[PDB]
């Protein structure tokens, strides 16, 4: 409908009403679609993700890192923004958690998930890039942080870029979105001292080749 793929995958507050099919033959977006990446930022290799998802023989969403039990040392409730409102309230993406310091600290974070069930798993996460050093102190406390993510195939260290940027959807900062696929038998790990937005939901799937995306107002 009105959502684009990034909205649907990230869990834009307005894409919650969309139903989920276990298999898709092709993907349809309307030309009027304009819901995704509500917190301004880049979605890396977005076109490649869109291509991979165009046809799926089997798809399921599951909670990869449960919101209430996975992060006892971090605050998983204050992670909201006016850029992604829900019924007028500050909110955030349904499939992601923006962790912030608990009390006055952000203990080093370390998590993993083992994909031993047989489907490939799409894992998304993102990185917060605060407008200023005051926001880094408000949200993470650790002044100089890094984020590290990896698997047997993926390995990347990220470092936040704090700067005042032009204001978009009232934000002077940015949040970038990254993703990878975890092949069966492998594991994905996350490590951070701040600025990491973590998945709570992830998608298990089996892909088909040869389909695509149609942009149209033609009814289904």
């Amino acid at each position: 409908g009105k959502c684009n793929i990034a909205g649907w995958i990230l869990g834009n507050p307005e894409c919650e009403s969309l139903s989920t099919a276990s298999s898709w033959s092709y993907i349809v977006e309307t030309p009027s679609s304009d819901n995704g990446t509500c917190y301004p930022g880049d979605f890396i290799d977005y076109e490649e993700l869109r291509e991979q998802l165009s046809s799926v023989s089997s798809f399921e969403r599951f909670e990869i890192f449960p919101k209430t039990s996975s992060w006892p040392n971090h605050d998983s409730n204050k992670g909201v923004t006016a850029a992604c409102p829900h019924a007028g309230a500050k909110s955030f993406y349904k499939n992601l958690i923006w962790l912030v310091k608990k009390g006055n600290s952000y203990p080093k974070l370390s998590k993993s998930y083992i994909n031993d069930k047989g489907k490939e798993v799409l894992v998304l996460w993102g990185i917060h890039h605060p407008s200023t050093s005051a926001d880094q102190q408000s949200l993470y406390q650790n002044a100089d942080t890094y984020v590290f993510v990896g698997s047997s195939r993926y390995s990347k260290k990220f470092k936040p870029e704090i700067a005042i940027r032009p204001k978009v959807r009232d934000q002077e900062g940015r949040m970038n979105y990254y993703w990878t696929l975890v092949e069966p038998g492998d594991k994905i790990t996350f490590e951070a001292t701040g600025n990491l937005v973590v998945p709570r939901y992830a998608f298990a799937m089996e892909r088909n080749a040869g389909s695509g995306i149609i942009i149209s107002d033609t009814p289904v």
């Epitope: 139903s19 989920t20 276990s22 399921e60 969403r61 599951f62 298990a204």
Partner: antibody
Framework: VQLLESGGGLVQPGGSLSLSCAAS????????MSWVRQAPVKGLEWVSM????????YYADSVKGRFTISRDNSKSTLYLQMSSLTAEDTAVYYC???????????????WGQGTLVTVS | DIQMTQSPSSLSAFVGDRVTIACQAS??????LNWYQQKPGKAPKLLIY???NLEAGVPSRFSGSGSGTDFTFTISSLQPEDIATYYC?????????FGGGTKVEIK
């Protein structure tokens, strides 16, 4: 979140009865749902499960089609229709939220309080 | 099917004692094991998932470990509020199954 069960009560041998579970506090349509049975003799066993979109079902082989599992996503309600009831079907039935839309990758689930079905 | 064996069927200990139970799979189930606490009159509450990952709101005295076919559950030092039947459940594949449960009494 909240799962509330109803139906149950006394059914004769044979016959049929409809059980149901109303859900709130979560998007019903986003998760698979299932039924679990607790007998006074056999502690716990699964009865049936249905995927979030209603596209896939699984039944215990103790049932073999004797019971039908279905959903109404618009009303956030889970149903179990049991037919041809026998003595072994006396148990407390419980509904649960499955942590995945597709069964296979769910890890944890939880139950609301159940209802008692007596066959006599 | 993979049928879990749980032992003892009943355990009793005094408050402050250290309490553990064991459970086995007939097949290697990696770590796809849940532990539940069933208080009388209540649906079982999940305490532990993926063999050792403690669930939200569960007291830190509860723990567990294990892999493959051999699993354990502990409630550390026993409190009177811990009277419950504890159950071993796995989700390696379908059908999901449960062990018989261990009734833990306190005195």
């Amino acid at each position: 979140v909240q799962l509330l069960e109803s139906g149950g009560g006394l059914v004769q041998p044979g016959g049929s009865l409809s059980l149901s579970c109303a859900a709130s506090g979560f998007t019903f349509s986003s998760f698979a749902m299932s039924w679990v049975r607790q007998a006074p003799v056999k502690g716990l066993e699964w009865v049936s499960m249905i995927s979030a979109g209603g596209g896939n079902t699984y039944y215990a082989d103790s049932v073999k089609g004797r019971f039908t599992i279905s959903r109404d996503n618009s009303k956030s309600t889970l149903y179990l229709q049991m037919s041809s009831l026998t003595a072994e079907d006396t148990a407390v039935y419980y509904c649960a939220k499955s942590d995945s839309s597709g069964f296979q990758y769910g890890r944890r689930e939880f139950w609301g309080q159940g209802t008692l079905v007596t066959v006599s | 099917d993979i049928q879990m064996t749980q032992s003892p069927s009943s355990l009793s200990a005094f408050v402050g004692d250290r309490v553990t139970i064991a459970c086995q799979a007939s097949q290697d189930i990696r770590i796809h094991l849940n532990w539940y606490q069933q208080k009388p009159g209540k649906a079982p509450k999940l305490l532990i998932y993926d063999a050792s990952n403690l669930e939200a709101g569960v007291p830190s005295r509860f723990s567990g470990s294990g892999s493959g076919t051999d699993f354990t559950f502990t409630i550390s030092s026993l409190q009177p509020e811990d009277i419950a039947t504890y159950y071993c459940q796995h989700y390696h594949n379908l059908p999901r199954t449960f062990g018989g449960g261990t009734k833990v009494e306190i005195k």
